[PDB]
């Protein structure tokens, strides 16, 4: 009809897959999906800004797994931060073992 449009980006499929994996016969609503996407985007932006600030303070320019782990430990509290660090280390080990 018209000269095309532009498509936005979201994480609806990923959120649905995570929900199906963590719970069977599950589901979600549009408002809850939007809230989850907004929370993911906010946490992503906050962690990215913290990693950039840490890289600028460390007189470096490459944000790596160490910078991301430090940002996660500074943002998340205690047990959640430890579990996130463990999951990130496991993912890094899996990526190093197989690419």
């Amino acid at each position: 009809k018209k000269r095309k449009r532009s498509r936005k980006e979201s994480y609806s499929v990923y959120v649905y897959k995570v929900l199906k994996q963590v719970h069977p016969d599950t589901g979600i609503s549009s408002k809850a999906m939007g809230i989850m996407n907004s929370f993911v985007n906010d946490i992503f932006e906050r962690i990215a800004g913290e990693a950039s600030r840490l890289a600028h303070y460390n007189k470096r320019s490459t944000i790596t797994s160490r910078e991301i782990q430090t940002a996660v430990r500074l943002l998340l509290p205690g047990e959640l931060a430890k579990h996130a660090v463990s999951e990130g280390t496991k993912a890094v080990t899996k990526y190093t073992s197989a690419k």
Partner: protein
């Protein structure tokens, strides 16, 4: 030849777009360079956080009993989890109410 090309999510074992995370880190003006393990670490952390929040939301949902996850259930889970309340302190969930957390003075005798 190219043989094959497995997806980053399949090679990392996660369910988050590592490629989109790397693209956002490269185009977000955060730094001139982006590492290799940093997007995977961020994707794993985000996936774990999403899974934990979805589990707490299901907990609050079965506590309130409804067919789908609603912002009211999300607020219930956030206020119930002490870690979630400490993390998202200045976060207000629209289309939801509060919790009956009251003292013990204003009571009918």
């Amino acid at each position: 030849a190219r043989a094959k090309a497995k997806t980053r999510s399949s090679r990392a074992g996660l369910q988050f777009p590592v490629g989109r995370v790397h693209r956002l880190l490269r185009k977000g003006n955060y730094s001139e360079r982006v590492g290799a393990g940093a997007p995977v670490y961020l994707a794993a952390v985000l996936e774990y956080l999403t899974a934990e929040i979805l589990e707490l939301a299901g907990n609050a949902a079965r506590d309130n009993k409804k067919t789908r996850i609603i912002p009211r259930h999300l607020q219930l889970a956030i206020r119930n989890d002490e870690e979630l309340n400490k993390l998202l302190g200045r976060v207000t969930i629209a289309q939801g109410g509060v919790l009956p957390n009251i003292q013990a003075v204003l009571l009918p005798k």
